[PDB]
Structure formats: structure tokens, C-alpha cells
Design a protein around this ligand. Structure first.
Ligand SMILES: Cc1cc2nc3c(=O)[nH]c(=O)nc-3n(C[C@H](O)[C@H](O)[C@H](O)COP(=O)(O)O)c2cc1C
Ligand SMILES: Cc1cc2nc3c(=O)[nH]c(=O)nc-3n(C[C@H](O)[C@H](O)[C@H](O)COP(=O)(O)O)c2cc1C
Ligand SMILES: O=Cc1ccc(O)cc1
Ligand SMILES: O=Cc1ccc(O)cc1
Lengths: 348, 348
């Protein structure tokens, strides 16, 4: 089974092709600290059998947070907690990765279960266009503000490596900051950072290159993207192919192919594996390795898309929230001897 | 659905009828201390939705351990650990229970995944018959040793309450000490503690009375029994009914109905629900509350044995090792809304 054949990326080898997708837990302290919630939540899935865990979106500056309880990585005082987190993940069998994030014009909303309303922070973005009815109007970054954010990703990456994380993902998807620079739905700038495809890719590619610089080649660098925003006149799969080419030229290791999030009022044809065609096109047409994500819930489904050459890595989100030992069941269903803790062998 | 209706036990409410059955982890320190393993293993199932967790067999004296790495409760220094386990379990949503134990003539074996061989301890028993070939001949207890063992159970019961457990279960099943006193297969005593059914019940019922005395009446005392030994001439269902009657008279609140274990070479008719008939017989003929356990893996199975009045409580073992969030899924299966952690809401 390809699902449980090791994968080479950078200079490391994942034990299998299943990854835990980044998933915001809104359970950090107001200072962005790791809490007991993360220390239970993540190593459970590591024991569960994924080769890699990508820790949820972690804000590279305070105003880059989604909620006031996001993980943050903007301070060296985040190190002890992040270190302990990576350590407990590796102890339970998985490679610890982390997604570095900046929430752009969508910064500052309550936790989903606290209503999730905007908190009205002073949020930044490409253009002064609110995300939707009732969001604050983003402040448009100038070149100085972009350099400061770019430097926060760089130090965030340095900090993640020092914490012992081995895979870094840059969040350039879902209408957060770097996503919103790519899409012409959110980015209507008339300077050298909007209009043309190159102008819109500029800042995101600068971040990728600046982070590639401080992440040694043996350590894989992912970039997650919305391969389409699903809007008319929006960012399309073809734009994604152009972007992947540039990323591949910068030495980026894998493109984690998501979609949507840039604006709210589009129709998104949800179905199992609906974003798989995006991982498949990039992979086959650009030669950049891809991660597939979106309604992947079945071992046979994961296997099949790998057998098809659609992706190199299968990322799982919601199924690992409800079924955190999924990957041990998966192995068994694909005729593979699952990696069970000896304490649990009588159960499998 | 009855599976998800509260169960009232004296002063105590279990929010549902699912309980995690006791399952030795063999992952304590040599001194019987709770470790990081228990702190991860147990709260996981608690978040998984179960109303009661019974912590694995916890030896009341060192010689009463199965392995060198069982939990123990023979010392005041066991309390910080035990107290933190219960606390984490409670915090994740379950009532914390604990199984108090003495391995008796099956005491002192290596961890299963290290060959499970006898270790040469001075194990005790009602009579000098070794468990099986390879196994030591136990020392028959005298009146001094029975009284010491009794007081260990009482003080273990007191310590457990101090650590914040609310359900106490006395392990009198599976060929361990109290169970071996019941069965004439292993109890061939010729004093007031062997021979007749009255004599064999004698030490076990002393232990129960004595523990009953120190557990506040608002808190449930459980006893687990092998309802048969599957052995010719052995302890039968009939015997269990007699014993059950006596326990009910004592103020025992529930019989947790297991079977077998007394000797190695017996034919046990394994099947889904195979021990359900014993929980059913005791409940309906004795009027004593029961817990069903044994190859229960399905929500519809769990609901049904309850609808039939077969048991009051459903205990899950192995299915919770490989599927820790079974109870959340069992809810949706039975048309009830899962009690999901809000971090997990979008996954359900
Ligand atoms: C509660 C929740 C939190 C999420 N947090 C993030 C985030 O941290 N970063 C990100 O790129 N995607 C995030 N996502 C998207 C998932 O990582 C995943 O791409 C998406 O849910 C589709 O995959 P799935 O169907 O397996 O869940 C989140 C989704 C959910 C359900
Ligand atoms: C690894 C393991 C450890 C167990 N430890 C105990 C023990 O602590 N005390 C006990 O009474 N039963 C113990 N059991 C038996 C279970 O608690 C349960 O009664 C039995 O496995 C049948 O239930 P199940 O089919 O749901 O697993 C253990 C079983 C296993 C698999
Ligand atoms: O919690 C929802 C969420 C979705 C996508 C993200 O990138 C981050 C958060
Ligand atoms: O480890 C297996 C085990 C089974 C039943 C018990 O009662 C105790 C331990």
C-alpha cells in the first residue's frame, strides 16, 4: 500500500503518506502559549499513527492571529511551550511540523463557539476592502509593513526550527494575508503589488524565498494555497500552476493544495476529494510534489488517489478530530500491519 | 436512547451508560506510580465521551500486583499521581472510578510484551495449587494474612476516595486472589474458608463488607466477578446468584459481570455478548444492578442489551483501545447529538 510506504522530502523520510492537516484549536493562552489542550490533542493523533503532524496556524505577529487564543510564534517566550509540543509529538511516533500564519483582513474574530464575530482589530491586507459585511476595513500594507511581516515569518521559522519542528508550512491559503495578495478579489492594488499575476505573487514569493533561506534544505518547506478562490475573475487553477512553478524554482518542497476562503459568497462544489484535481494538476504538470486535502475519509480513497499520481501526501483534517486512531484502522484495511503501542496490542 | 440516559447510583449520576472497562497498561513506575502514559491514555477516552472510566487493576499491596509496572495504591506517595489522574479524567468529562486488586496466585509476571513469564515472587493463594505449569505454588493465607489483605483493600479504598475517585470496584474475578477463593477449582481449603459455598464466599464477603464500610453511601461500590469459571465442578452461574444476593445484602451497588480466568485449560464460548447472559440472570433474578462486558463493539448492540433489561451499565474494553472516541460516534448512531468538545464541533 502506497499509504504506508515511506516518503522522502528534503533530507528526511516520513514513515507513511498520512499527515494531520493544520486545525485551529483556539485553545492557547491570550499570550499565544501552548496549553494542556494542545499537549493532549496532538500526541493522541501521533499515537494514532500519522507520519507527520502539521500543528495549526501559528501567528507570526499578534495582529496575524485569527482569534485571541491562537498559538503564536512571535516571541522567544513561545519557545518552551512549542518545544514541549514538538517533543511530545515525536515521542508518540510522528514528525512534528507547524504551519506559520498571518490572518490578514480576516484577523481578530471570536472563537467559532463564542459566536466568532470580528473583534474590530486594526487588521492589515493588500487593499482597503473589508472581508465581508461587518468586518473592519483592512489597513493596506506599504512596502515597510510587508518587510516587517516578511521578517516575522523568517524569525517564526527560525523559532520553529529551534523548537525542534522539522517541517515548516507557510499558510498562503484561505483568504488570510498572503492568500489575499494573490487573489484579485481581495487585492485591487494599483502599485507593484497588485494588478498583474507577477505583481500579486510578489509578496508571497518574497516570503517563500526569505523563509527558504533560513530553513536548511534537509528540512521540508510546504506552502499551502487556495488553488482557486471559486470566484468569477478570481484566482484560478492556471494561476496556481504559475505560482507552483515559481515556488518550485525557489526550492519549496511541496504544495499543499486547498481552496476558497478569499471571499464568502461563492459556491464551492464540496464532494469527497474535490480539491484532489488541484493537487493532481500541479503535480503532473509542474512537477512540484503535492499534498491532497478535502473530505478524505477512507483508506481506500487515500490509497487510490496516491495510486493515481494525484498527490504525494494525504492530509487528513476532520476525520482525525472524530477518529484520531484512523491511521491504525487504515493500515489494517490496506492489508498492512498497523503500528500499535504494545499497551494496545490486544485491541487490534 | 437508553445508552445515553443518566444512570443513578446512590448519590451519584453517570451521564450515560457507557463505561471504560479496567485495562492494565503495565506502564507505571517500579514503585507503582501513575506516569505520563496514564495521563494521556485515560483522558483521551474521557474526551471520547464515556460517562465512567474504571482505572485498571490497582494493587492494594506490592505482592498483589500482576506486573512490576502495575499502578499501586499501597502508599501515601501514590496519592499525588492518583489524584492528578482522576483530576484529568474528571476534567475531560468522565466520572473517575478505580479497580482495586490483588493478583494472588497469578501475581508477579512480566509485561505481556516482554514474555509475561513468572518472576518468582512469594505469591499468596487460598490453597497451594499453582495457577498452571510454569507457575509458582502459592502460599496459602493464614488468618493473619487475610486480615492484612483486607485492611489493604480498605486503606486502598480510603486512599482512592482521597484522590478523588467516586466509584470503587473490587476485583474478585479472573483467577486473582478473591476470585480464587470463590472457585473450588483453586480453593481447596479445609477451614472456615474452603469446602462449602458458604465458606468460599467467606473471605470475599468480608472484604466487600469492610470496604463497603469506608465508602460513603452516596458513592457506588462495584464488585467484578467471574460469573462462571467455565470449569467442570467449578464456580457456576448458580453460585454467582447466591454470591450476588449476599453482596446486595451488604450494600454493594452493582455486579460487573465477567467470567473465566480461574484456570487456563477451559473451553470458553467466545462471541459478541457471550457474558451478557450472566449480567441478565443476576439483574432479573436477584434485583442487583449489573454491568455487561465482553465483545461489545456496536452502538446498536449496546442499546439493545439495555432495552432488554440485561444490564444497567455497558462496559467497553478493547474497542476503546482502538477507537477512543467510540462514544461520540455511538451517539449519532442512535439519533442522539454527540457531546463533542467545542474544539471538535466541526468534525461531527
Ligand atoms: C476546526 C478547523 C480548524 C482548521 N484550521 C486550519 C488551519 O489551522 N490552517 C489551515 O490551513 N486549514 C485549517 N483548516 C482546514 C483543514 O486543515 C482542512 O484543509 C479542511 O478541513 C479540509 O480537509 P478535511 O475534509 O479532511 O477536514 C481547519 C479546519 C477546521 C475543521
Ligand atoms: C490489555 C487488557 C487489560 C485488562 N485489564 C483488566 C484489569 O485491569 N481488570 C479487569 O477486571 N479486566 C481487565 N481486562 C479485561 C477487560 O476489562 C474486559 O472485561 C474484557 O476484555 C472484555 O471486554 P472487551 O471485549 O470490551 O475488551 C483487560 C483486558 C485487556 C485487553
Ligand atoms: O477554524 C477554521 C479555519 C479554517 C481554515 C484556516 O486556515 C484556519 C481556520
Ligand atoms: O492484562 C490482562 C488482564 C486481564 C484481566 C484482568 O483482570 C487483569 C489483566
Amino acid at each position: 500500500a502506497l499509504l504506508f510506504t515511506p516518503l522522502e522530502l528534503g533530507g528526511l523520510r516520513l514513515k507513511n503518506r498520512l499527515a494531520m492537516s493544520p486545525m485551529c484549536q483556539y485553545s492557547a493562552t491570550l499570550e499565544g502559549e501552548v496549553t494542556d489542550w494542545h499537549l493532549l490533542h496532538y500526541p493522541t493523533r501521533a499515537l494514532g499513527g500519522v507520519g507527520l503532524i502539521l500543528v495549526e496556524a501559528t501567528a507570526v505577529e499578534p495582529l496575524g492571529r485569527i482569534s485571541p487564543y491562537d498559538l503564536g510564534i512571535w516571541s522567544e517566550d513561545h519557545l518552551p511551550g512549542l518545544k514541549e509540543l514538538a517533543r511530545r509529538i515525536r515521542e508518540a511516533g510522528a514528525v512534528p511540523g507547524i504551519q506559520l500564519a498571518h490572518a490578514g483582513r480576516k484577523a481578530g474574530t471570536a472563537r467559532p463557539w463564542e459566536g466568532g464575530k470580528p473583534l474590530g482589530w486594526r487588521v492589515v491586507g493588500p487593499s482597503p476592502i473589508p472581508f465581508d459585511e461587518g468586518y473592519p476595513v483592512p489597513e493596506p500594507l506599504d512596502e515597510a509593513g510587508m518587510e516587517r511581516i516578511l521578517q516575522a515569518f523568517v524569525e517564526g521559522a527560525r523559532r520553529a526550527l529551534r523548537a525542534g519542528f522539522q517541517v515548516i508550512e507557510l499558510h498562503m491559503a484561505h483568504g488570510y494575508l498572503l492568500s489575499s495578495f494573490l487573489s484579485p478579489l481581495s487585492n485591487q492594488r494599483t502599485d507593484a503589488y497588485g494588478g498583474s499575476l507577477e505583481n500579486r505573487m510578489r509578496f508571497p514569493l518574497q516570503v517563500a524565498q526569505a523563509v527558504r533561506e533560513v530553513v536548511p534544505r534537509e528540512l521540508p518547506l510546504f506552502v499551502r494555497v487556495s488553488a482557486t478562490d471559486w470566484g468569477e475573475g478570481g484566482w484560478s487553477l492556471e494561476d496556481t500552476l504559475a505560482f507552483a512553478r515559481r515556488l518550485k524554482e525557489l526550492g519549496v518542497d511541496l504544495l499543499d493544495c486547498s481552496s476558497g476562503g478569499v471571499v464568502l459568497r461563492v459556491r464551492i462544489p464540496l464532494a469527497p476529494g474535490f480539491q484532489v484535481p488541484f493537487a493532481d494538476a500541479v503535480r503532473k504538470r509542474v512537477g512540484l510534489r503535492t499534498g491532497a486535502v478535502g473530505l478524505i475519509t477512507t483508506p481506500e480513497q487515500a490509497e487510490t488517489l496516491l495510486q493515481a499520481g494525484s498527490a504525494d501526501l494525504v492530509l487528513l483534517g476532520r476525520v482525525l478530530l472524530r477518529d484520531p486512531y484512523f491511521p491504525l484502522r487504515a493500515a489494517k484495511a490496506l492489508g498492512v500491519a498497523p503500528e500499535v503501542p504494545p499497551q494496545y496490542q490486544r485491541g487490534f
